[PDB]
């Protein structure tokens, strides 16, 4: 069973990084496990670890034959030796605190089926490469993050004329949080969206339409999904299909903090209660400005990879939100507004690259 008569080498797809003023940066592979499968059976496996980044793997021992597949998992915390293909493809990941320090940002890739010949085989190497069997020439293997990213590129406040005498908001004093974030996902599949109904929040807020509180849904605090506001600050998150169930479950990025009076002091009575009962803030004066990420609605403008919201989170996309606040927020960011929130959004959607080096 252990005898081999071939090696496989491959190149990983990489690109020019032009990510600059954002915390959530492009991918760098520091740990990679490459496997060769013949149907369900793992016929080769090699793990490499390089702090400087991995862009190719050479000389993986394996067995010649038809219809082999290269399966890759990177930046991971799994034990993969000997697993069947079914086992590997059933692996999940979950959002954890270390993900927000860019640790265990799982990446995967999988080739189409190809023939391995005896001797030295090369997958995704350049055209004309010296080989006993060159496959996928000029198309390196795509090994990509399972996580997406959501961040604020910027938040500005320009209170509309009707609110200028009544309210102010200071983003420098604010926090940001993810709401209605899927807890888990698959790591292989046409879509990574899991059928669990488990979600996370960075800050507890009142139940509304978007809150996962229907039968079988769970909704738990994850403190790593809140941070202070700063330009480019945000969160790694997982795939989600917003309309998978009977009620919408949009992943939300929100900024929240004190709704102040026109002079930047706390609201006092009666202005405080006027604002609370209008739905703007809670008893402490806290107001929320939610953005439904990649939602088709609410006047949101999109550029980059898309110009229309898709009502989902897709792996390896960085959703960079520029928010303009023009009025008081809401005390219930997990409800839709009856008319329209006092905010405008432009969102640049940029896929991450694997940094070339
Ligand atoms: Na509900």
UniProtKB/Swiss-Prot annotation:
The keyword Acyltransferase does not apply. Synthesized as palmitoylated precursor. Efficient export to the outer membrane and integration into fimbriae requires lipidation and subsequent proteolytic removal of the lipidated propeptide. Keywords: Cell outer membrane, Fimbrium, Lipoprotein, Membrane, Palmitate, Signal, Virulence. Residues 352-357 are annotated as: Important for oligomerization and fimbrium assembly. PROSITE patterns: PROKAR_LIPOPROTEIN. The record marks 18-19 as: Cleavage. GO terms for molecular function: structural molecule activity. The keyword Membrane applies. GO terms for biological process: cell adhesion. It holds the Pfam family P_gingi_FimA. Strain ATCC BAA-308 / W83 seems to lack fimbriae, probably due to very low expression of the fimA gene. The name (major fimbrium subunit) does not indicate the abundance of the protein, but is derived from the greater length of the major fimbriae. In strain ATCC 33277 and strain 381, major fimbriae are 300 - 1600 nM in length and about 5 nm in diameter. In contrast, minor fimbriae are only about 80 - 120 nm long. This length difference is observed only in a small number of strains, including strain ATCC 33277 and strain 381, and is due to a loss of function mutation in FimB, a protein that restricts fimbrial length in other strains. Belongs to the bacteroidetes fimbrillin superfamily. FimA/Mfa1 family. Structural subunit of the major fimbriae. These long, filamentous pili are attached to the cell surface; they mediate biofilm formation, adhesion onto host cells and onto other bacteria that are part of the oral microbiome. They play an important role in the invasion of periodontal tissues. Fimbriae and their constituents are major virulence factors. FimA proteins from different strains have highly divergent sequences, and this has been used for classification. The sequence-based classification correlates with pathogenicity. This is Major fimbrium subunit FimA type-4.
């Amino acid at each position: 069973v252990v005898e081999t008569n071939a090696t496989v080498s491959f190149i990983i797809k990489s690109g020019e990084s032009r990510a600059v003023g954002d915390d959530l940066t492009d991918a760098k592979i520091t740990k990679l496990t490459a496997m060769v499968y013949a149907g369900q059976v793992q016929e080769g496996i090699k793990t490499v670890e390089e702090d400087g980044g991995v862009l190719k793997v050479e000389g993986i021992p394996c067995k010649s034959g038809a219809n082999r597949v290269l399966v890759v998992v990177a930046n991971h915390n799994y034990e993969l030796t000997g697993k069947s293909l079914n086992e590997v493809e059933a692996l999940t990941t979950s959002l954890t605190a270390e993900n927000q320090n860019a640790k265990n940002l799982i990446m995967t890739g999988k080739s189409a089926a190809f023939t391995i010949k005896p001797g030295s085989n090369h997958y995704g190497y350049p055209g004309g490469t010296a080989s006993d069997n060159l496959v996928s020439a000029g198309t390196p293997l795509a090994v990509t993050r399972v996580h997406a990213g959501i961040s604020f590129a910027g938040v500005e406040v320009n209170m509309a004329t009707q609110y200028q005498n009544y309210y102010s908001f200071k983003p420098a004093d604010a926090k940001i949080a993810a709401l209605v974030a899927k807890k888990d996902s698959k790591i292989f599949g046409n879509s990574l969206v899991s059928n669990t109904n488990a979600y996370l929040y960075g800050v507890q807020t009142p139940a509304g339409l978007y809150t996962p509180d229907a039968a079988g849904e769970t909704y738990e605090l994850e403190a790593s999904l809140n941070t202070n506001y700063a330009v480019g600050a945000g969160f790694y998150v997982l795939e989600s299909k917003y309309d998978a169930s009977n009620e919408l479950r949009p992943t939300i990025l929100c900024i929240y903090g004190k709704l102040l009076d026109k002079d930047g002091n706390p609201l006092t009575e009666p202005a405080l209660t006027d604002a609370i009962n209008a739905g703007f803030c809670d008893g402490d004066g806290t107001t929320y400005y939610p953005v439904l990420v990649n939602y088709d609605g609410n006047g949101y403008i999109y550029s980059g990879a898309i110009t229309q919201g898709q009502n989902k989170i897709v792996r390896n996309n960085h959703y960079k939100i520029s928010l303009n606040i023009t009025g008081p927020g809401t005390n219930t960011p997990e409800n839709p507004q009856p008319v329209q929130a006092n905010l405008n959004v432009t969102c640049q959607v940029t896929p991450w690259v694997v940094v070339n080096q």
